[PDB]
Design an enzyme around this catalytic site. Structure first.
Site, PDB file in Angstrom:
ATOM      1  N   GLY A   1       0.853  -1.148  -0.102  1.00  0.00           N
ATOM      2  CA  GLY A   1       0.213  -0.200  -0.441  1.00  0.00           C
ATOM      3  C   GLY A   1       0.386   1.220   0.055  1.00  0.00           C
ATOM      4  O   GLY A   1       1.927   0.652  -0.181  1.00  0.00           O
ATOM      5  N   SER A   2       0.494   2.169   0.102  1.00  0.00           N
ATOM      6  CA  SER A   2       0.566   3.750  -0.003  1.00  0.00           C
ATOM      7  C   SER A   2       1.820   4.305   1.085  1.00  0.00           C
ATOM      8  O   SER A   2       2.178   5.040   1.120  1.00  0.00           O
ATOM      9  CB  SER A   2      -0.151   4.784  -0.352  1.00  0.00           C
ATOM     10  OG  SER A   2      -0.377   5.970  -0.233  1.00  0.00           O
ATOM     11  N   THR A   3       1.631   3.163   2.332  1.00  0.00           N
ATOM     12  CA  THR A   3       2.423   4.082   3.540  1.00  0.00           C
ATOM     13  C   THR A   3       4.305   3.278   2.728  1.00  0.00           C
ATOM     14  O   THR A   3       4.593   3.995   3.287  1.00  0.00           O
ATOM     15  CB  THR A   3       2.253   2.463   4.282  1.00  0.00           C
ATOM     16  OG1 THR A   3       0.565   2.322   4.974  1.00  0.00           O
ATOM     17  CG2 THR A   3       2.670   2.601   5.088  1.00  0.00           C
TER      18      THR A   3
ATOM     19  N   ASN B   1       1.086  10.506  -3.845  1.00  0.00           N
ATOM     20  CA  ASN B   1       1.206   9.570  -4.775  1.00  0.00           C
ATOM     21  C   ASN B   1       1.815   9.351  -5.980  1.00  0.00           C
ATOM     22  O   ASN B   1       3.060   9.030  -6.353  1.00  0.00           O
ATOM     23  CB  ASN B   1      -0.011   8.639  -4.881  1.00  0.00           C
ATOM     24  CG  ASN B   1      -0.138   7.154  -3.970  1.00  0.00           C
ATOM     25  OD1 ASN B   1      -0.042   7.421  -3.130  1.00  0.00           O
ATOM     26  ND2 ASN B   1      -1.484   6.912  -4.556  1.00  0.00           N
TER      27      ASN B   1
ATOM     28  N   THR C   1      -3.148   3.057   1.101  1.00  0.00           N
ATOM     29  CA  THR C   1      -4.713   2.642   0.634  1.00  0.00           C
ATOM     30  C   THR C   1      -3.434   1.494  -0.650  1.00  0.00           C
ATOM     31  O   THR C   1      -2.936   2.063  -0.996  1.00  0.00           O
ATOM     32  CB  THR C   1      -4.895   3.717  -0.371  1.00  0.00           C
ATOM     33  OG1 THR C   1      -4.650   3.923  -1.198  1.00  0.00           O
ATOM     34  CG2 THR C   1      -6.321   4.585   0.886  1.00  0.00           C
TER      35      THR C   1
END
Lengths: 641, 641
Positions: free
Chosen positions: B384-386, B445, B583
């Site tokens: 995910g975006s983390t 992102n 996400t």
């Protein structure tokens, strides 16, 4: 006190690692002052000595052993140790170093002497290194034809002085530009580089044919260099060589500063066997020049040849048959595993790469959406609908599939129940009554999905596990092991069903596919592929039952013979074939619609002489792997029985 | 002639493997006729002897050594060998067997004697086996609280005789059905199984609370059995035990025919340490009954306990916080790697599984789309975006990223150029001026994609490679190593970009994510997670630079503190936090639209006492990992400093 001996050993160890890590100034700064009983030189001079000598022999990796530090007087401690280091002529071993330390209040220093460079050195001695580069070995096919060899290349170039002033200069460039297929902007740019000098020969291109008319200034010179006879047809497999850099030498001193190194494919994989070993002599001399000690000396050893299972004629045919489209073709002699062809399309020109390539031409290869640099035969892909034959074998082995049971299937779409939502398995032919044979002939995915679900995951995996998923094949080609799915469980009837007809999360490269499908040419025995001619044949018994094979192969002959068999175009050839076509629907983010991969599997069911797996990736409309298989099939059938 | 000795040895070897493979009739058929100097029994009697005796001791795996076959007379050859075999009491070793062979024309047979069962047997001797089952060990948390233990369970059941005729019988079933939450159809079905007898106690359910009013026929009996105090909150990790089958014993005779075996999770992973070893005696007696020889004998050894790093209180909180939705939460003490919680939701009731479960209830678990059986903490997912924080660290380490450089980004969509087609990277907040800190706070992102492309693949992988992709973590939990992508190259700017913000082909399970993110709590040092309390802490230095950490953590505090930080709701808690939300957009074939995974990463940046990674899979609208993190964060902060 051994309290000082502690620091004594410590000092030497620090000195040693300083040299080991090439930081000579740090080592120099641990030496005593310049004196008769202390250091023979100043720091700057010690620094310069190592940098000059260790640099000349590409010394690297100084490691010691058997360290000892005793005492002789209040102010002095003697030390000794064995040592070894790597050089451009190999490793020096069992070297005996010794000297003394100078204790002073809380400072222990080394009374440096030239003998701490090389043990036998004294005063103003010198070091001399002489070398002979080894000739690179060759890569040859199963019959000795060269795949990677050393040729004598014709090299075209121009001499600015003999070109002109303005009148002929502009016209002479025209002449050579058209006479040799060269943009005249490249020629002007070439002759105007900062290094070019009016009189020098400015190289431009390699003439790979008969030398034509030579205009004014244009001239040809022979040069030796690597040559790839099959060109791009075997570029991904063979790979290419490039100029050795200072950086390469830093990693491995045993390479030739002035040579060539494998940058890709087999040239790299076997770079060591192929490069041989440098010949030469590393010796210590005295002030005058008399040889005083030979540290290392050995004659050059040229590289040894590597003989592959590849059939150069098959490689070229397999490659050409792809017509420059994205795809790959693997061919074998399934009973022994020999890899006759490893084609990947599109490709790149390995001769350009190794002979200096335009920076824009290189970028053109990289930005090409079809990615010619990829070795498609070693890249994992969903195997496609062809995989139905594996699923079928497993079903016959475990008794889930009765060849004669006839499923009733209506239409072209099917789902187990509403839990599948809008998802449905799809087939191309709407055949109502479908038994196994009929499913293989028409490539009916609905039939196999249903049988896979019937069988269930536990049994399906029990069968898949007998294949080679997870295994690292023993080949000098970089690849990842095949996988059934991302995890040990599908956790999904849809994935279970899709896996049944070669879709889902399956990743199997073409070499691995040929390995798996070999069971049909060895009564259920799987035969590992091999690329090195002298290598021994390795196999794996009872992957599938002999009954399953005897049931399925006759059905695969019908895929060709039957008027509605998916591979019926191949029946015209009039050669014994057992085949299976397949497809794989793939999704992309850049494309609106989805892409389709076309596959063909085929072998001679009479003699098991050859086998081939071919695929077109993201095929154009109306294109097909089968549509392009004839020539190769005719050739293999002819020469592999 | 040794021509006969060849066959002599061969006969014995065949006889031995026949016994080894449990085919006693085949072994019997290699014996001489019944006589005084030949075989002591007929084939049928020999067959029955092994089947009876070897079956009684669960003999398995007969292997021999030091075989010798000499001759004594024209018609007879003597043989001898050492042997060993496994039994329900362990391996028997150094057994000395001997006998003779009978040569006859082209047939060599064994003059069978009872001493070819067990060496010291003679005539009508008997074999006796006695055993004591070992008590199963316990699985306990970091403070001794039980996770898998042996309790004394209350078991409800009915006695058909004491139930009624028609009047009360129907009414008494009503009473117990409502008094204990039981479908009265299950009760009737229970009491009418083929095995039930009018007078027997028919078990129905396990009462896990205070025993209530007991109607007519209903009665309670104590029984010992496994008990899982945390219930479904730790079911995937702990797993459950089941009845040992004849099939389990066939694979391993050292199990207790009458016992319990780990079928899943840790109960299985540590089944051996936990089960202990059977106690008993295997002896040979004479016709009468007198003990003649003790073949094996040893006292029982109960199973030993296994102490985990898990904090039972944290496990339950982590699990409950998921509110029965699909997701997982991992929590650690990042400086040592201790796994405090390994939650996966939804889950299944391990107490039902181990105490006999309805065949429809079991199927309900399997068909549940959310798949409770999956161990989400050990399943690979796109992080995910983390993951932007990892990409950022790499960019700072290699100098590609200047924290202060401000990218100008317009809108919510971006693509490098038209080659990307309709594909575009997407962000949620339209912030024009974006530097690193701003990108982390808003979870931008587009910014990270651009920086990833700028950096390029070679450098990005150089950084990723310093992490743990490819490694097999040393944990008693089945899992696959994390991967960057399917191949060594992306062969795609889009994939390179997507990988930059945690999408693409990345597969990293939550335990592996916590391992990677630990670098932010150890100045760039990665600390491997551990689950076994006594295990030693293992780490890996210099995964990222200390500067990168000192730059990024302050930005991660802003993700919480800043009014527009994605994790600002957590600032209310008033506890020191550094966090990062994320996400992951995923596609499914069954669903029309795509699914979204929500993530939260958080730790105490003041003391590095705890760390947690949480995710909601395929989240419902408006749901979020952050929205459910408070209680756990409050708890860990309180007890892990």
């Amino acid at each position: 006190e051994t309290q000082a001996v502690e620091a004594g050993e410590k000092t030497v160890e620090q000195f040693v690692q300083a040299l080991n890590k090439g930081d000579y100034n740090k080592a120099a700064e641990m030496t005593s002052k310049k004196a008769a009983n202390k250091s023979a030189l100043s720091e700057k001079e010690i620094l310069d000595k190592y940098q000059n000598i260790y640099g000349a022999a590409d010394v690297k990796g100084l490691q010691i052993s058997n360290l000892k530090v005793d005492k002789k007087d209040d102010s002095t401690y003697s030390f000794s140790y064995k040592a070894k280091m790597n050089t451009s002529l190999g490793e020096l071993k069992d070297l005996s170093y010794k000297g003394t330390l100078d204790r002073n209040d809380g400072q222990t220093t080394i009374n440096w002497q030239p003998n701490l460079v090389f043990p036998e050195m004294e005063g103003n001695d010198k070091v001399s290194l002489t070398t002979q580069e080894a000739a690179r070995g060759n890569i040859i096919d199963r019959n000795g034809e060269p795949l990677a060899t050393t040729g004598k290349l014709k090299q075209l170039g121009v001499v600015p002085s003999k070109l002109g002033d303005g009148g002929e200069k502009t016209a002479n460039i025209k002449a050579i530009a058209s006479s040799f297929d060269l943009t005249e902007d490249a020629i002007n740019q070439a002759i105007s580089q900062s290094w070019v000098q009016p009189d020098y020969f400015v190289p431009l291109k390699i003439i790979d044919g008969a030398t034509p008319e030579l205009p004014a200034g244009a001239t040809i010179q022979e040069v030796d260099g690597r040559y790839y006879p099959l060109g791009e047809a075997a570029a991904q497999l063979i790979g290419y060589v490039g100029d050795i850099t200072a950086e390469d030498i830093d990693k491995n001193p045993e390479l030739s500063s002035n040579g060539k190194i494998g940058r890709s494919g087999l040239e790299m994989a076997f770079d060591k066997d192929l490069r041989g070993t440098t010949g030469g002599k590393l010796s210590i001399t005295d002030a005058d020049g008399v040889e005083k000690k030979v540290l290392i000396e050995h004659e050059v050893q040229n590289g040894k040849d590597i003989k592959l299972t590849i059939d150069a004629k098959a490689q070229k045919t397999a490659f050409d048959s792809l017509g420059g489209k994205a795809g790959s073709t693997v061919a074998t002699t399934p009973k022994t595993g020999d890899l006759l062809a490893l084609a990947s399309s599109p490709s790149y020109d390995p001769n350009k790469m190794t002979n200096g390539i335009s920076q824009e031409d290189y970028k053109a290869y990289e930005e090409n959406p079809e990615q010619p640099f990829i070795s498609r035969f070693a890249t994992g892909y969903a195997p496609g609908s062809t995989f139905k034959m594996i699923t079928a074998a497993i079903g016959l082995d475990n008794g889930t599939i009765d060849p004669n049971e006839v499923l009733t299937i209506n239409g072209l779409k099917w789902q187990k129940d509403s839990s599948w939502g809008s998802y449905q398995v799809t087939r191309v032919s709407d055949v109502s009554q479908v038994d196994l044979k009929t499913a293989l002939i028409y490539s009916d995915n609905i039939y196999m999905a249903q049988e896979t679900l019937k069988m269930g995951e536990k049994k399906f995996r029990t069968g898949l596990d007998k294949f080679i998923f997870g295994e690292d094949l023993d080949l000098p080609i970089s690849m990842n092991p095949a996988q059934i799915s991302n995890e040990d469980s599908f956790n999904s009837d849809i994935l279970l069903a899709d896996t049944g007809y070669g879709q889902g999360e399956l990743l199997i490269n073409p070499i691995q596919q040929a390995a798996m499908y070999s069971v049909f040419a060895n009564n259920g025995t799987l035969v590992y592929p091999k690329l090195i001619a002298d290598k021994e044949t390795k196999d794996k018994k009872n992957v599938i039952g002999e009954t399953a094979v005897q049931t399925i192969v006759p059905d695969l002959r019908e895929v060709v013979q039957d008027v509605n068999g998916t591979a019926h175009s191949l029946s015209a050839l009039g050669i014994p074939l057992a085949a299976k076509t397949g497809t794989a629907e793939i999704k992309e983010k850049q494309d609106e619609k989805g892409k389709e991969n076309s596959f063909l599997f085929a072998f001679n069911p009479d003699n098991q002489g050859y086998m081939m797996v071919s695929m077109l990736e993201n095929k154009e409309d109306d294109d097909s792997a089968t549509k392009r298989a004839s020539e190769l099939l005719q050739y293999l059938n002819q020469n592999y029985q």
